[PDB]
Design an enzyme around this catalytic site. Structure first.
Site, mmCIF file in Angstrom:
data_model
loop_
_atom_site.group_PDB
_atom_site.id
_atom_site.type_symbol
_atom_site.label_atom_id
_atom_site.label_comp_id
_atom_site.label_asym_id
_atom_site.label_seq_id
_atom_site.Cartn_x
_atom_site.Cartn_y
_atom_site.Cartn_z
ATOM 1 C CG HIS A 62 -1.743 -1.268 1.313
ATOM 2 N ND1 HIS A 62 -1.512 -2.234 2.267
ATOM 3 C CD2 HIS A 62 -2.761 -1.731 0.546
ATOM 4 C CE1 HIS A 62 -2.352 -3.239 2.083
ATOM 5 N NE2 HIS A 62 -3.121 -2.958 1.046
ATOM 6 C CG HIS A 92 2.907 5.713 5.964
ATOM 7 N ND1 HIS A 92 2.624 5.566 7.302
ATOM 8 C CD2 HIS A 92 1.832 6.349 5.430
ATOM 9 C CE1 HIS A 92 1.424 6.111 7.539
ATOM 10 N NE2 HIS A 92 0.896 6.602 6.430
ATOM 11 C CG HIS A 94 -0.601 8.648 2.150
ATOM 12 N ND1 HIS A 94 -1.436 7.555 2.139
ATOM 13 C CD2 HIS A 94 -0.205 8.788 3.440
ATOM 14 C CE1 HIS A 94 -1.508 7.079 3.398
ATOM 15 N NE2 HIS A 94 -0.776 7.794 4.232
ATOM 16 C CD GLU A 104 -3.907 9.625 3.048
ATOM 17 O OE1 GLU A 104 -3.625 9.509 4.261
ATOM 18 O OE2 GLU A 104 -4.487 8.738 2.402
ATOM 19 C CG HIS A 117 0.582 10.225 7.068
ATOM 20 N ND1 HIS A 117 -0.396 9.451 6.471
ATOM 21 C CD2 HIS A 117 0.283 11.539 6.898
ATOM 22 C CE1 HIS A 117 -1.258 10.310 5.958
ATOM 23 N NE2 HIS A 117 -0.892 11.579 6.191
ATOM 24 C CB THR A 196 -5.995 8.016 5.828
ATOM 25 O OG1 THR A 196 -4.659 7.596 5.543
ATOM 26 C CG2 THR A 196 -5.963 9.286 6.695
ATOM 27 C CB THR A 197 -5.083 2.661 5.113
ATOM 28 O OG1 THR A 197 -4.360 2.397 6.318
ATOM 29 C CG2 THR A 197 -4.279 3.635 4.262
HETATM 30 N N1 LIG Z 1 -1.921 6.940 6.796
HETATM 31 S S1 LIG Z 1 -2.105 6.852 8.436
HETATM 32 O O1 LIG Z 1 -1.144 7.583 9.220
HETATM 33 O O2 LIG Z 1 -3.453 7.160 8.908
HETATM 34 C C1 LIG Z 1 -1.831 5.174 9.035
HETATM 35 C C2 LIG Z 1 -0.926 4.812 10.033
HETATM 36 C C3 LIG Z 1 -0.795 3.476 10.440
HETATM 37 C C4 LIG Z 1 -1.550 2.465 9.877
HETATM 38 C C5 LIG Z 1 -1.419 1.015 10.350
HETATM 39 O O3 LIG Z 1 -0.599 0.853 11.241
HETATM 40 N N2 LIG Z 1 -2.167 -0.133 9.875
HETATM 41 C C6 LIG Z 1 -1.916 -1.437 10.545
HETATM 42 C C7 LIG Z 1 -2.926 -1.930 11.453
HETATM 43 C C8 LIG Z 1 -3.257 -3.340 11.540
HETATM 44 C C9 LIG Z 1 -4.297 -3.753 12.476
HETATM 45 F F1 LIG Z 1 -4.624 -5.049 12.577
HETATM 46 C C10 LIG Z 1 -4.971 -2.785 13.287
HETATM 47 F F2 LIG Z 1 -5.924 -3.173 14.145
HETATM 48 C C11 LIG Z 1 -4.637 -1.399 13.194
HETATM 49 F F3 LIG Z 1 -5.264 -0.487 13.949
HETATM 50 C C12 LIG Z 1 -3.631 -0.968 12.291
HETATM 51 C C13 LIG Z 1 -2.446 2.818 8.878
HETATM 52 C C14 LIG Z 1 -2.601 4.134 8.452
HETATM 53 ZN ZN LIG Z 2 -0.532 7.634 6.013
#
Ligand SMILES: NS(=O)(=O)c1ccc(C(=O)NCc2cc(F)c(F)c(F)c2)cc1
Ligand SMILES: [Zn+2]
Ligand SMILES: NS(=O)(=O)c1ccc(C(=O)NCc2cc(F)c(F)c(F)c2)cc1
Ligand SMILES: [Hg+2]
EC number: 4.2.1.1
Length: 258
Positions: A62, A92, A94, A104, A117, A196-197
């Site tokens: 992603h 990371h 975007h 974003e 971010h 945001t994901t």
């Molecule tokens: N662009 S951003 O800064 O908003 C952003 C920051 C981190 C994550 C992330 O850590 N996903 C993993 C993840 C896996 C899981 F299983 C969870 F439960 C969870 F909360 C997050 C996603 C988006």
């Molecule tokens: Zn992000």
């Protein structure tokens, strides 16, 4: 068969598997500078990244994440609208397929080439897993990137992208200093939002810096050469991995400056 940014599994479809997508505090949002409330009680941000320990960079399909050792208070964020200590866990970006899009968050509807971010979790919760289940569990520091002069501190990241071209690839990435990615000023806007994901959990306090950092056309070009797919699968360039602005609803964007 899993979320993405494509026509068939993009942001408009996420709500089917993650109903929170249509929630009350979703991110990103458009920052209308004329409606943002200057809040004098906001304390200055405290960014202490001098003991930061980066360990690895990975293409997760992603975006690409640079992970840090968060076992101790080595790189933290405090102050601002925050109550407590927040440890840096990963950062990371975007970005877009063209320079006129990629961020974003938008400022007065203006989109930047990309958005950085820096993800932090609240230490009072013990681990990131517990923090995502809380309203004030995460703090993300957002920094806009505009195309202009090269950013020296970003080059080390740019050079390693070749080794993590496809999904699932990772490379050792030690001794990287995140201080090299910060703008001169730490003035910011803040509002309560979400990841945001997917899973799109509403556990984030967003701190978006007013001043963007400049990166060269050549630097952003290298981001666009990464792949969403894994090795051996059809090639899909990793571009436009950004979510469009969401309704502000009953939220107020506060600003640390007049
Ligand atoms: N662009 S951003 O800064 O908003 C952003 C920051 C981190 C994550 C992330 O850590 N996903 C993993 C993840 C896996 C899981 F299983 C969870 F439960 C969870 F909360 C997050 C996603 C988006
Ligand atoms: Zn992000
Ligand atoms: N200490 S370390 O380097 O070995 C380490 C690095 C990254 C992660 C991770 O990204 N978990 C997912 C994840 C990341 C986030 F930033 C979140 F907000 C979240 F909810 C889940 C865990 C440990
Ligand atoms: Hg939460």
């Amino acid at each position: 068969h899993h979320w993405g940014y494509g026509k068939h599994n993009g942001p408009e479809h996420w709500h089917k598997d993650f109903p929170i997508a249509k929630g009350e505090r979703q991110s990103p949002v458009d920052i209308d500078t004329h409606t943002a409330k200057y809040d004098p009680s906001l304390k200055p941000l405290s960014v202490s990244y001098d003991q930061a320990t980066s360990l690895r960079i990975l293409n997760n399909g992603h975006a690409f994440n640079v992970e840090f050792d968060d076992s101790q208070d080595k790189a933290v964020l405090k102050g601002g609208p925050l109550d407590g200590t927040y440890r840096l866990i990963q950062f990371h970006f975007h970005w877009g397929s063209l320079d006129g899009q990629g961020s974003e968050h938008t400022v007065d509807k203006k989109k930047y080439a990309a958005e950085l971010h820096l993800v932090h979790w609240n230490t009072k919760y013990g681990d990131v897993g517990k923090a995502v289940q809380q309203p004030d569990g995460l703090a993300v520091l957002g920094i806009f990137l505009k195309v202009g002069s090269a950013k020296p501190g970003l080059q080390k990241v740019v050079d390693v992208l070749d080794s993590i071209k496809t999904k699932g690839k990772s490379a050792d990435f030690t001794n990287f200093d995140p201080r090299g990615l910060l703008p001169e000023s730490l003035d910011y806007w803040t509002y309560p939002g979400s990841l945001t994901t997917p899973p799109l959990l509403e556990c984030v306090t967003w701190i978006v810096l007013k001043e963007p950092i400049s990166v060269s056309s050549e630097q952003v070009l290298k981001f666009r050469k990464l792949n969403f797919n894994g090795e051996g699968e059809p090639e899909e360039l990793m571009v436009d991995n950004w979510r469009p602005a969401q309704p502000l609803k009953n939220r107020q964007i506060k600003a640390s400056f007049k």
